[PDB]
């Protein structure tokens, strides 16, 4: 809820936050700048930053598949609790460990 959502940053700003103020497993949510008005989950993993698309249909949030949520907070909580569901193309597990606040 609230704190880990950063409304006024770009993708590069998000990376700099994660790469200088967070650790491996840190993440935040932010508005998509290339797909308005969707959302992006920027996650730091292995010294790099992966950006994940969140679909906002106006009725629910999801990741273009899987469970559908009323709010962003429910989506994030779900994917923190269900560790191991989110994977890269090679099979690398995307881990949502530490929300980066403010």
């Amino acid at each position: 809820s609230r704190r880990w959502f950063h409304p006024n940053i770009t993708g590069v700003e998000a990376e700099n936050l994660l790469l200088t103020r967070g650790v491996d497993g840190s993440f935040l949510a932010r508005p998509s700048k290339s797909n308005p008005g969707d959302f992006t989950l920027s996650v730091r993993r292995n010294g790099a930053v992966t950006h994940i698309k969140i679909q906002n249909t106006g009725d629910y949030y999801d990741l273009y598949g899987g469970e559908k949520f009323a709010t962003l907070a429910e989506l994030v909580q779900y994917y923190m609790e269900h560790h191991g569901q989110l994977k890269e193309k090679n099979g690398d597990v995307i881990e949502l460990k530490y929300p980066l606040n403010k």
Partner: protein, 93 residues
């Protein structure tokens, strides 16, 4: 290897650039391009998306005589849909 290679400015004006890049070995679904003044750390940077079939893009509205950074990510569809492995270059208009 999902990192795009050979990102270049192949045409330039004081206010605009035409960039080109070669596709990575792992075939891409889409690219994400971001750009902004070097040193600004991402403040007020612009970004847009193009499909994986496109390997060129035009960037406009640039200040003359200013250092810019240009970054291209590789994006994939799946569970989840994501983009990463960026490539960056610098260019002074």
């Amino acid at each position: 290897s999902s990192v795009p290679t050979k990102l270049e400015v192949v045409a330039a004006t004081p206010t605009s650039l035409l960039i080109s890049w070669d596709a990575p070995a792992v075939t891409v679904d889409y690219y994400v391009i971001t750009y902004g003044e070097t040193g600004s750390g991402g403040y007020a940077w612009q970004e847009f998306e193009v499909p994986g079939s496109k390997s060129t893009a035009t960037i406009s509205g640039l200040k003359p005589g200013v250092d810019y950074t240009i970054t291209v990510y590789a994006g994939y569809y799946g569970y989840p849909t994501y983009y990463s492995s960026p490539i960056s270059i610098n260019y002074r208009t």
